[PDB]
Paper text:
The determined crystal structures revealed new conformational states of the [name] molecule carrying the M200W mutation and allowed a high‐resolution observation of an acyl‐enzyme intermediate with the [name] mutant.
The [name] enzyme [name] catalyzes the hydrolysis of L‐Asn to L‐Asp and ammonia. Using a nature‐inspired mutagenesis approach, we designed and produced five new [name] variants (M200I, [name], M200K, M200T, M200W). The modified proteins were characterized by spectroscopic and crystallographic methods. All new variants were enzymatically active, confirming that the applied mutagenesis procedure has been successful.
Numbering used by the authors:
A (entry chain CCC): 4 to 15, 19 to 158
B (entry chain AAA): 2 to 157
C (entry chain BBB), D (entry chain DDD): 179 to 313
The structure:
Amino acid sequence: AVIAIHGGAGAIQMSLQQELRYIEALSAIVETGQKMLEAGESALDVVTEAVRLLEECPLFNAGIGAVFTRDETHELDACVMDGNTLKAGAVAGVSHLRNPVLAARLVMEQSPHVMMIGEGAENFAFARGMERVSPEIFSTSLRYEQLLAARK
Amino acid sequence: GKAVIAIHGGAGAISRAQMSLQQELRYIEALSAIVETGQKMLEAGESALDVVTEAVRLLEECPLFNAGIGAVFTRDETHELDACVMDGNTLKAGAVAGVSHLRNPVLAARLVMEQSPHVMMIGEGAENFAFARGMERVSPEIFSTSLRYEQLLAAR
Amino acid sequence: TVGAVALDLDGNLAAATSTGGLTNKLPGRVGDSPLVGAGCYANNASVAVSCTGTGEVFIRALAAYDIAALMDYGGLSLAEACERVVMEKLPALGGSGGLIAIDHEGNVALPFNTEGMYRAWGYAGDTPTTGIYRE
Amino acid sequence: TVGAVALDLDGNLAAATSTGGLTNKLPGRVGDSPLVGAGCYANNASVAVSCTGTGEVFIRALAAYDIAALMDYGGLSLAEACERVVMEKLPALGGSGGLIAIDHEGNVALPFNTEGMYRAWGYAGDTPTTGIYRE
Ligand SMILES: [Cl-]
Ligand SMILES: [Mg+2]
Ligand SMILES: [Mg+2]
Ligand code: NA
Ligand code: NA
């Protein structure tokens, strides 16, 4: 029994102490996931919680710390798949759901559908008690600066 | 290999014990006219990508088929259309989902493939991308048919 | 749902799929139709596929690319891959429907596990065939 | 993009992907992350995969399921399938990125063709390994 996680690949400049924020984040999340597996938690709950924690963590391009669209908005995408049932749930283009991976899980668990998009996705979630949030909550200085840099 | 087209207008419990011969022949002549148009293009050296785009455009236009004109209704009595096209040569693909203001989703899909760096666009974003590339905006009601509305009422 | 697959005189494969989805569908639901390798796939190395049916299962089973992967990696023929996917794997997951497929070698297949599939095919220069029911 | 793949004490695989997408994307753009078999896949018969990178290439290459299909049909190891997909096929299409994969027997792989991939892994009852750069 085992977990892996990622916080995105690309052109990774940096001091050790900068690097260690990413390392301590990754370490704490993989360890949370490790403890759940050891305690007999399901693979599906473990990957949901790890990705929920990676969403919450503003260092990573998912939930809080999402990149910006050309219109300086956030549009978030998530998927979760159960290799046992081959059930999957997915949301795309959602701006008002704090934890897209939880929305994805809801689509898997409390619809017969695999993928939901946009306001349809959001209304489905709201209808099952998931909270509405304003897209501003994902916004960070670092991703905005990267948007300005992408423009030139 | 030797040039060829196949098309479909959906699989399901199409039952003989509901359809008349006259209803069945409308479906056969539809399918026949579209596969023949696609056959003429292939014979004329048109590309598989142009041929599948036109065939699906014709299937969208035909109100007998649950795509573009003659699309089913959602729970909210709206239309929400989806399309994909893929080029086996480049492995490029373009796709729209959740579009209500584009007459021919497969043309929007082609546009995503040909005139964006993206493969998939959804919803109002998909539509705004298409409008900004000069694709015409249409009323969602143009896809609405009496047949599909009645089927909605029968489902509920 | 509607679809097209073609193999051209250049030996190029392409696939397209369009749909209005399901009657009474929950707004924002996406089935296999717009999803690369679920409802639509084309690769000159393998096959062009377009799918129709219970879109959730076509996504979970990645029906279109699975034909491609069964042929390319599994060494299945188009016929074998179509049988495997449509008649075994999709029913296995409670998936109903079918698909249309043409491979790099110009084989055409129109499998469905349903009562009917509105379908047609034709070789360039030949008489086309149309179908609705089985047989 | 972020991701998780796990194998549990019941021998079950799961995968998850979440993302803000690509910086400065057109509003309405969807990458691989929510697309089953593009950015996220899990099958007890093969592997659990979560992807990060050029989402358009991950969709076109159906990166996640291709790992599953190379293992299941091609008879590759996870390592071979990961190398083939990330180091050969994705670059071949101008795709940059990586992914995390666990197979049904608990082999773990974290391939990337980029300068870095924020990653960690750890067997239950063992100390975890973290990484940013190559090796
Ligand atoms: Cl490192
Ligand atoms: Mg042409
Ligand atoms: Mg209609
Ligand atoms: Na985050
Ligand atoms: Na139509």
